[PDB]
Design a protein around this nucleic acid. Structure first.
Ligand SMILES: [Mg+2]
Ligand SMILES: [Mg+2]
Ligand SMILES: [Mg+2]
Ligand SMILES: [Mg+2]
Ligand SMILES: [Mg+2]
Ligand SMILES: [Mg+2]
Ligand SMILES: [Mg+2]
Ligand SMILES: [Mg+2]
Ligand SMILES: [Mg+2]
Ligand SMILES: [Mg+2]
Ligand SMILES: [Mg+2]
Ligand SMILES: [Mg+2]
Ligand SMILES: [Mg+2]
Ligand SMILES: [Mg+2]
Ligand SMILES: [Mg+2]
Ligand SMILES: [Mg+2]
Ligand SMILES: [Mg+2]
Ligand SMILES: [Mg+2]
Ligand SMILES: [Mg+2]
Ligand SMILES: [Mg+2]
Ligand SMILES: [Mg+2]
Ligand SMILES: [Mg+2]
Ligand SMILES: [Mg+2]
Ligand SMILES: [Mg+2]
Ligand SMILES: [Mg+2]
Ligand SMILES: [Mg+2]
Ligand SMILES: [Mg+2]
Ligand SMILES: [Mg+2]
Ligand SMILES: [Mg+2]
Ligand SMILES: [Mg+2]
Ligand SMILES: [Mg+2]
Ligand SMILES: [Mg+2]
Ligand SMILES: [Mg+2]
Ligand SMILES: [Mg+2]
Ligand SMILES: [Mg+2]
Ligand SMILES: [Mg+2]
Lengths: 260, 143, 56, 178, 132
RNA sequence: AGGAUAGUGGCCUACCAUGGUUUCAACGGGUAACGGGGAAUAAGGGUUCGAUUCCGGAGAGGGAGCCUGAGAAACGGCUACCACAUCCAAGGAAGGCAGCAGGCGCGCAAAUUACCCAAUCCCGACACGGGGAGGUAGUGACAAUAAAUAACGAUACAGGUUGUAAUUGGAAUGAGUACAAUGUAAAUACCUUAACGAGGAACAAUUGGAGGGCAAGUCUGGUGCCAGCAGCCGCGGUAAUUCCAGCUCCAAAAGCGUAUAUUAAAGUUGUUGCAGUUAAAAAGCUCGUAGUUGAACCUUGGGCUUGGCUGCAGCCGAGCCUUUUUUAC
RNA sequence: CCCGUCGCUACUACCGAUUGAAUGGCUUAGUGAGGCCUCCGGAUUGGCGA
């Protein structure tokens, strides 16, 4: 109606932000950016609701206006900047590096990483095509455009971005046996290897994935993210739980043993 | 075979037959025809205010013998004239000509109650004061 | 019908004041009072139990 | 506006208002437990009716059903934890056999009277309401507080109460100070 | 009477140049402990300047004898004055309550000023010329 | 085929064909109709509701046309007409609360012309400004939660070692009031807490009833087919268990009653699941299109090996050997 | 026990001359504001243009 919306009602916010109902009428509307609104995590949510460094939105803005927060090695001062999957957030004042990777419960884990691993990131190739003057380029899942990619790189592949020069270190071809994290649907956050890709021309290709505990699930290729060349060899540190889904009874047993 | 279709593909016939036959149910018919909206003196409301035109005594029906003391009230919302019973011993003395009275039904939902013939409403308040409060001398009529 | 007799009986009923009596207990105390009065000191007349025996 | 806040009723009235058998059973049960009104009995019947409904729903499922095992064990565990269900009756078939007196046994008022801290159940209620009784190191003045098994041994007079080592109350201080 | 202060969920936050924590106060035989006295006690306990200590959001448990709130300790008074809310600095005496007209008056003045194009001096000089 | 549009398209134009929908309900009419997530009631199946905290749509008195702009056919933008309506020195000029508060009117029916950007978020050139968005308090028995109005002894009696009925005590407490601290942007309230604060503890619980349905009087006075009660059946004509009252009792209780709608009860709408000889209801009788519905029949048995799960059996899965087109579900 | 004219009282709906009356939507025809596009025009205003 006459133009873009600028507000986000609290109840209409993505559920994986884990916002409380009664704290207010509105929720942080993520800005336009590398990641989609529904699949992002604004820095205000990360710094106040997750890390609890800031006590309120005034404080998260005070933190970010002092140039502390970096996303993918670049300073961001937008409190609603849409950080997303595989993004690296650096707070060198506290000497902390985080990567936004889904945990098996469907949420963005607070996943601390070493400084050496915080120097790169992975990106799922969305499309490969030719730019002006016949220069090929790759579009990753976070909207990055890398020119002159390896001519072997195709869609659904994973590239390793140097994240300081923006170049491609090396890549992983999408194929059977590759380590995968699921980035959408009800299997979001699970980690396994590709068992069989079932093609459907004009429809949605389906990928069969086997967990490390030999559990098999099916998910859309659009929800499939290659993160490693084989089982047990991920190119990034996995969050606690290793993307292994436990039943609610198993979780209850594990909590009973963990707590006594 | 019980006189109704049983085939797996006869849902249209069953639905239409039920739809035709619910019109024989007066509650459904009155709800969809909107008779309260069109015909009811209150227009579907629970209560209605009006002005007292005259105080009238109505002879009760047999085998009872008494004078039920009612009033003729002209409703403000639509100008219709109705007869409203004034409950309790001596509350007619609380009702004067050209008073504003709030009316309500007898609880029989449009029918006359008891031996009172042709009367379907009762006085709840007069001059903005509850008739029960006036009867029990809890409050006084503003005059 | 004639309206002259409205309020006849109530008007001519001889006024009697309510006798002043101690307040009855409220709430849990009242539930306790009924409980004892009906299940502790039972006053049944050999199977004839009446809540409000008129004086006779 | 802000999201709505949930609320719900905690009781349900009988369908037939006047029934001597139910009225007598209710009055006997209220007299036994020093209850204020019939609504405190309706509340127990309501929550037992929905405990039974949940157990019945799980009991229609096959044994070894993941949902029956998970929610049945949780419901049994909760009832054993609050002492309503005995430790040797953890079968989800004895849950259906539970009765409102099992729940009224576990009220704070009943436990206060049964621990000897009060002369009668009605003394128990006024002791609780008058902030004399503490569970653990926390004062509880709600008579319907359902006492847990781990809380059973920690019911005692408040440390700052006249009956539990505190100073003398208003009346005594006014009497001995004159 | 033997006020005991416990701090839990302590987080060092150099982003806002402060340490932040939840405060548990055990105050038997005491209604509660005032914020000024808690700030003094916290200053003694952690050897920080009193003006760098901020406490707020206290509530007494049911039955008394204990209160819980939140506390901040800054590395310096300048940092506290830089990151603290104005109303808290006014609470602690580190700032003066700003004096402004009521919200109705400020809005009414804004709408009156919306009717003048150019300087007020020009507008009133022209109005004076018109009325003289 | 073109024009126009950001672009497809009878969207529009020219020419040419005569097509397109419909008893499987088109078209028209009604809606006291914005749709959905949902709500009420609910053995199951259902019936009823959804203006209204979220999502989509639409509108800004009724129409219509535009400017600017990425974005509007915008109305706290403009232009014109219609209807209302304001100031005027009579020449002219300015309007749009279905934003917040407030008023009138309408009615059975609904609150303050309060405080603030402290929180939630949004906007801007922006760490700083603004936001009746939003938050806070006020009114508020819409609904919902918890929960006081008393507790315990001794005498005296009655009573079968203890349940009370009375006149005698000393304890306990919050309703309320208040230093103070907390709360808060500042307050209010809550939570804590000095001092005060209970015998008729007047710090006094109400709303409906006592013929049946339906729990609780055949007590006393009044009236006398009157007055009145009574959802229904009925009560009242001189000992009224029913009216008006006193006493007593009953039910729910900080709530209780009344009116209206709706749901269950209703197997009195029946698919589950009604009835049709006589209670309402088999067309006077045949034909007949749509609809509904339609006999049986096409790889069965046998053999071997093996995996899993329940306590030798049983239950599922397999794999070989035996001649080995469209749907619906 | 009971039916129907007829008579009294009250209420509800119906027909009915009055080419009855009032209110709202849609529409033929006629008249037609205003914007937009287009066509010339060319107050004045820069060096042919606006
Ligand atoms: Mg809008
Ligand atoms: Mg495609
Ligand atoms: Mg069939
Ligand atoms: Mg075309
Ligand atoms: Mg064409
Ligand atoms: Mg139709
Ligand atoms: Mg409508
Ligand atoms: Mg509803
Ligand atoms: Mg709706
Ligand atoms: Mg609706
Ligand atoms: Mg709606
Ligand atoms: Mg809603
Ligand atoms: Mg909306
Ligand atoms: Mg609009
Ligand atoms: Mg408006
Ligand atoms: Mg208009
Ligand atoms: Mg607007
Ligand atoms: Mg407009
Ligand atoms: Mg407006
Ligand atoms: Mg308004
Ligand atoms: Mg309105
Ligand atoms: Mg009182
Ligand atoms: Mg009565
Ligand atoms: Mg009875
Ligand atoms: Mg008598
Ligand atoms: Mg008599
Ligand atoms: Mg009586
Ligand atoms: Mg009534
Ligand atoms: Mg029904
Ligand atoms: Mg029948
Ligand atoms: Mg017959
Ligand atoms: Mg017949
Ligand atoms: Mg026949
Ligand atoms: Mg035939
Ligand atoms: Mg067939
Ligand atoms: Mg067949």
């Amino acid at each position: 109606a006459r133009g873009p919306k600028k507000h986000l009602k609290r109840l209409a916010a993505p559920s994986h932000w884990m916002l409380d109902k009664l704290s207010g009428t509105y929720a942080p509307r993520p800005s336009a950016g590398p990641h989609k609104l529904r699949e992002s995590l604004p820095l205000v949510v990360f710094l106040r609701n997750r890390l609890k460094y800031a006590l309120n939105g005034r404080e998260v803005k005070a933190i970010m206006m002092q140039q502390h927060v970096q996303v993918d090695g670049k300073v961001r001062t937008d409190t609603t900047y849409p950080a997303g999957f595989m993004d690296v957030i650096t707070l060198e004042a506290t000497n902390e590096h985080f990567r936004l990777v889904y945990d098996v419960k469907g949420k963005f884990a607070v996943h601390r990483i070493s400084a050496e691993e915080a120097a790169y990131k992975l990106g799922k190739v969305k499309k490969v095509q030719l730019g002006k003057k016949g220069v090929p380029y790759v579009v990753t899942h976070d909207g990055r455009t890398i020119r002159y990619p390896d001519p072997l790189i195709r869609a659904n592949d994973t590239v390793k971005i140097d994240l300081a020069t923006g170049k491609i270190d090396d890549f992983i071809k999408f194929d059977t046996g590759r380590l995968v994290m699921v980035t959408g649907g009800r299997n979001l956050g699970r980690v396994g290897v590709i068992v069989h890709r079932e093609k459907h021309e004009g429809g949605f290709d389906l990928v069969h994935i086997k967990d490390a505990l030999e559990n098999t699930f099916v998910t859309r290729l659009s929800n499939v993210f290659v993160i490693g060349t084989e089982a047990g060899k991920p190119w990034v540190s996995l969050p606690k739980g290793k993307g292994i889904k436990l039943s609610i009874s198993e979780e209850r047993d594990r909590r009973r043993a963990q707590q006594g | 075979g019980k006189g109704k279709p049983r085939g797996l593909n006869s849902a249209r016939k069953l639905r239409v037959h039920r739809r035709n036959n619910r019109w024989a149910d007066q509650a459904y018919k009155a709800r969809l025809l909107g008779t309260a909206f069109k015909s009811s003196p209150f227009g579907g409301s629970s209560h209605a205010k009006g002005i007292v035109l005259e105080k009238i005594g109505i002879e009760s029906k047999q085998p009872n013998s008494a004078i039920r003391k009612c009033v003729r009230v002209q409703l403000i919302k639509n100008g219709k004239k109705v007869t409203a019973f004034v409950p309790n011993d001596g509350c007619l003395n609380f009702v004067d000509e050209n008073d504003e009275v709030l009316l309500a039904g007898f609880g029989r939902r449009g029918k006359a109650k008891g031996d009172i013939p042709g009367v379907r409403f009762k006085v709840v308040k007069v001059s903005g004061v509850s008739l029960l409060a006036l009867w029990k001398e809890k409050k006084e009529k503003p005059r | 019908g004639s309206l002259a007799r409205a309020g006849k009986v109530k008007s001519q009923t001889p006024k009697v004041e309510k006798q002043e009596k101690p307040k009855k207990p409220q709430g849990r105390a009242y539930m306790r009072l009924l409980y004892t009065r009906r299940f502790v000191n039972v006053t049944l007349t050999n199977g004839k139990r009446k809540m409000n025996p008129s004086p006779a | 506006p802000r999201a709505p806040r949930t609320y719900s009723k905690t009781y349900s009235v009988p369908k037939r208002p006047y029934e001597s058998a139910r009225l007598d059973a209710e009055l006997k049960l209220a007299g036994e437990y020093g209850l204020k009104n019939k609504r405190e009995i309706y509340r127990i019947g309501f929550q037992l009716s929905k405990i039974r409904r949940a157990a019945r729903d799980l009991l229609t499922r096959d044994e070894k059903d993941p949902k029956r095992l998970f929610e049945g064990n949780a419901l049994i565990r909760r009832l054993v934890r609050i002492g309503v269900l005995s430790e040797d009756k953890m079968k989800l078939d004895y849950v259906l056999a539970l009765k409102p007196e099992d729940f009224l046994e576990r009220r704070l008022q009943t436990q206060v009277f049964k621990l000897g801290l009060a002369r009668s159940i009605h003394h128990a209620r006024v002791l609780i309401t008058q902030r004399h009784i503490a569970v653990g190191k926390q004062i509880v003045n709600i008579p319907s507080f359902t006492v847990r098994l781990d809380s059973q041994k920690h019911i005692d007079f408040a440390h700052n109460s006249p009956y539990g080592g505190g100073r003398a109350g208003r009346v005594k201080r006014k009497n001995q100070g004159k | 009477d033997a006020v005991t202060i416990r701090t839990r969920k302590v987080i060092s936050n150099p982003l806002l140049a402060r340490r932040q924590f939840v405060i548990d106060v055990l105050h038997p035989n005491r209604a509660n402990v005032s914020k000024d006295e808690l700030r003094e006690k916290l200053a003694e306990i952690y050897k920080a300047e009193k003006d760098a200590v901020s406490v707020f959001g206290f509530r007494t448990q049911f039955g008394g004898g204990k209160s819980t709130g939140f506390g901040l300790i800054y590395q310096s008074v300048a940092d506290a004055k830089r990151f603290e809310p104005a109303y808290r600095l006014v609470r602690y005496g580190l700032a003066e309550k700003v004096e402004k007209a009521s919200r109705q008056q400020r809005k009414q003045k804004k709408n009156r000023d919306k009717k003048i194009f150019g300087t007020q001096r020009r507008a009133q000089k022209r109005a004076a010329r018109r009325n003289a």
